[PDB]
């Protein structure tokens, strides 16, 4: 329970798999930010910012290899643990803009969700209590040192004096969806 001291840290990479449901993810990170994930069904590398893949490749087979190995390890460890199931955590969210809010100037609203476990979640946005799906992006599940995850959702918006926003989080560890409110 003590940090390792370093100038930089690469996660090359991180793998998670869970059963039942056959849900998994494979990513690489550098200094805490996502480089890519591998789409395991499409068998393709998806870069976090398109520029990352202009000079560099990652073969998706590496992600398929890690996921296959983790499915194998999960079977063995599940039995060895006497079939001890995961504990559903209660995630917690905070909402903040990317840039200082200026009238009429396009901006991005960020919903940061922490203490996610297992890594299955729905994060959605409301504007003036109405669901908004246009201009919404999500990160992969990013790893925490205690082996939970965090995730961020992004909502393109134009600040006004006539808009109220909510981030809505649904998770198995929540009895009812939690709403995180935000106004200028």
């Amino acid at each position: 329970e003590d940090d390792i001291e370093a100038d930089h840290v690469g996660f090359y990479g991180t793998t998670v798999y869970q059963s039942p449901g056959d849900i998994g993810q494979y990513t690489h990170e550098f200094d805490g930010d996502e480089l890519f994930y591998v789409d395991l069904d499409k068998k393709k590398t998806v870069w976090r910012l398109p520029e990352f893949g202009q000079l560099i490749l990652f073969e998706p087979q590496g992600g398929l290899q890690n996921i296959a190995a983790e499915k194998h390890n999960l079977g063995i460890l599940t039995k060895r643990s006497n079939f001890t199931p995961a504990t559903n955590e209660a995630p917690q969210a905070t909402v903040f803009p990317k840039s200082p809010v200026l009238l009429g100037q396009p901006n991005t609203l960020i919903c940061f969700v922490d203490n996610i476990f297992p890594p299955v979640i729905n994060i959605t946005w409301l504007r003036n209590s109405k669901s908004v799906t246009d201009g919404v992006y999500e990160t992969s599940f990013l790893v925490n040192r205690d082996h939970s995850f965090h995730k961020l959702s992004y909502l393109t918006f134009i600040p006004s004096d006539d808009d109220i926003y909510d981030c809505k989080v649904e998770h198995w560890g929540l009895e009812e969806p939690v709403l995180k409110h935000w106004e200028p």
Binding site: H8, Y12, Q18, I56, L77, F96, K98, P100, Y154
Partner: protein, 200 residues
Amino acid sequence: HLVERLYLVCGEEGAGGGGGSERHFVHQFKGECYFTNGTQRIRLVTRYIYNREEYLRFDSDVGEYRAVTELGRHSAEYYNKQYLERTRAELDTACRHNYEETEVPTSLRRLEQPNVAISLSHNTLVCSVTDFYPAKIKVRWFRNGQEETVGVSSTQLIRNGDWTFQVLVMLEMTPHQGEVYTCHVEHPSLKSPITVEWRA
């Protein structure tokens, strides 16, 4: 002439040894490469985790797999028999290669200049410093040309998840006609600081 990013191999346990209402079972593998002073020092740590419990770890400072908990006691013996030399070799073929050949030309060259703005919110000035990369930054407050040390407070560094950061830096102040307050930002993307002034 694309360059390949490589990965740390997830070792397999030996077999046969020894939905909100549904149970779920989770396994994780984390391959971590720690770098200091370029690649002069590299440390490799791989972790195998059942649900939330890390039970097995390779740490290149130790040089072999070790059980982290009782759950990993026989795992560590099996992995040291099957994967020990392969894992030791990944420090060079994966960690060092990725750093020197893929991070040096990309991540480590990324420079995003901060944007700086001041707002007043008895009382307190707030300097919002946004959209910068990398994380190393220094934010200083001045009043009429002299640096303020208190009451200067800062939020935590905020990670936006899009390879930028932001931070808020606050100054406890009382406005008088007609002082000048300056937020002063030094960052590796800037040859000389960015400053913003605020006047009563």
